[model samples]
Target: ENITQWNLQDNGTEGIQRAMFQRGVNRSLHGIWPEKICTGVPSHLATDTELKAIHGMMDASEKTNYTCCRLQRHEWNKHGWCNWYNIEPWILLMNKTQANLTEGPLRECAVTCRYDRDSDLNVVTQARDSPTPLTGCKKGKNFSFAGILVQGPCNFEI
Candidate 1:
């Protein structure tokens, strides 16, 4: 995802609710972060500390995805928010293997993927090409994902 402008903010509601919005956590026109030129994974994959950090990141993201999905649905019922059955709320999984060190080759990392929908619901007149990466991974050099690009379809009931 192209999270060049990613930021977290208090939802202005009850509790310390936070909202996650970014340009490319799913996919980016400018490609992935860390310049997409990085090679070689970190050497600390066996440590529990690093692994926990990575897993924690993914867990937090899962919450974010659920929150976004619920809020959008609430809007659909509370207000006159449009609904797109084809673009049903979905959470893209970001596996730990997708992480790679970014800062200083071991300081940070990024998890990303590509997603596109081709449903014929034909509800929304215009289509938005924003890439929405699912919350399921973390950034850590200890984590690694390596494989040729793969494409497939996934479905989830709202």
Candidate 2:
């Protein structure tokens, strides 16, 4: 499955809720932040500290989007909750990742990783093409900003 976007606030009545719109295989586009990028032999939950830190950076934009508190939680339960990099390391990755993605338009550029659910839920990172190829998302265009080029993690939920 491909994600249209994460931390989406499209549903007005959803409150502090968030969304990970899986754009089916055809419309795939689509994070959890620094992202787990791990093999989930066993899952771990984010502590208050880790959760709070992620929430602070992924706040809402009202018109553009909304806070990422719940999104963080979903990522935690589904991806971040791993055995090796579940706790401190996960938070650190999230911290650095959020900073790397401070620029919005270029976020899609970092879609270089994928979680292989059948393979012990291992995370895979490599250079790849943009699934969405959304408008105004090319590397060089009207807007100019340093791009990380490394996209966040994408979970194949098909």
Tell me, by lDDT, which candidate is best.
Answer: 2
Candidate 1 has an lDDT of 0.22
Backbone clash count, each prediction separately? 8, 9
Q: Best-fitting candidate, measured by TM-score?
A: 2
TM-score of each: 0.18, 0.39
Report the CA-based lDDT of candidate 2 relative to the real structure.
Answer: 0.36
lDDT of 2 by residue, 1-158 (tens): 32324322112113222221221111111144333344544456555556667523443333434344555555556666562355676566565555543323333332222322333221222112234333323332221112112232322221
**lDDT of candidates 1 onward, in order:** 0.22, 0.36
Give candidate 1 regions above 4 Å deviation: 1-32, 41-43, 54-56, 59-158
Over 40-97, each residue of candidate 1 has an lDDT whose tens digit, in order, gives 4322222223223322122123444522333222222322112211212211111122
After the best TM-score superposition of candidate 1, give how far the Cα of residue 60 lies from its true spot, in angstroms. 12
